[PDB]
Structure formats: C-alpha cells, structure tokens
A and B are shown apart, each in its own frame.
Chain A
Amino acid sequence: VKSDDVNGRTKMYKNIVDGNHQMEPGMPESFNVLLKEIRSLGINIELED
C-alpha cells in the first residue's frame, strides 16, 4: 500500500469501504514492469510456479 502506484489504490479503497481489508500479492507491480523490461522480456526464464 504505502507508496505510489495508485493502480491498486482503487482496490484498496473498495475493500476498505466494503470493510474487506484485503489485498492481492500480485507482483512488485514495478517488477512486473521490470519484466516489461527483461531486456524487453529478453530474460523471461521466469519459471512461475
């Protein structure tokens, strides 16, 4: 929660208003952006399990 990417800000606000108080691990959204990198995905041996 505590920074900048307002993308899950909407989800956080909706969950809190619902009192859901829930979050999704997802990816460093910025490391998902670093995959966007990945030498342009050049390095994607990423064996997500």
Chain B
Amino acid sequence: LPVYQGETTQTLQDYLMWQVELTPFTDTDRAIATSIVDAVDDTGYLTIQIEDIVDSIGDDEIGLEEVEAVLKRIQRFDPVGVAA
C-alpha cells in the first residue's frame, strides 16, 4: 500500500511510456518518446505537438527531425495510433 494503479499492459498512456521503455533507445530518444506520450490528451492523440515540447525544453540538441523520429518509433506500439 505504497501507491495505487489501474489496468496495466493496458497501462494507459503509461503503458505507451513503458513500451517506449520496453524498447532499445538512447536517452534523447526515450526523453522525446516520453514527451510525446505525456503530451497525449484523453482522446489518445499527442496532446502537445513537437513544437510545444521543443519550446518547453528549449534544447537545440532535441530537434524536429529527432523528435519526429522518436515519435514515429512510438507511432504504433501499444496500441496502434498513439500520440496521434
């Protein structure tokens, strides 16, 4: 009884975050996949686009191409069409 949780493997947006954590990726790829996943609304689409994540980060190393690649690697893992 430290914390509480719901459906898993089936773990909701966090299931997408885990499937991202369930694949081989670097620190930046995982960070961008997490930015895509956490920025997903209740409709399942990517709530905040790549531009919003880049602006909030303010990091030149994270680029539009890198963010798009990390999101496309996370386009359809669990389930298909997440962070739409």
Contact = CB atoms under 8 A, between A and B. Distances in A.
Size category of the binding interface on chain A: under 10
B6 interface: no
Contacts of A6: 8
Contacts, number: 9
B21 interface: yes
B2 A33 contact: yes
| Majority-rule SS of A interface residues | helix
Interface residues of B, number: 6
B45 interface: no
Contacts of A13: 22
A33 B2 CA distance: 9
A32 to B, nearest CB: 12
A10 interface: yes
A10 B2 contact: no
A21 interface: no
Interface of B: 2, 8, 18, 21-22, 24
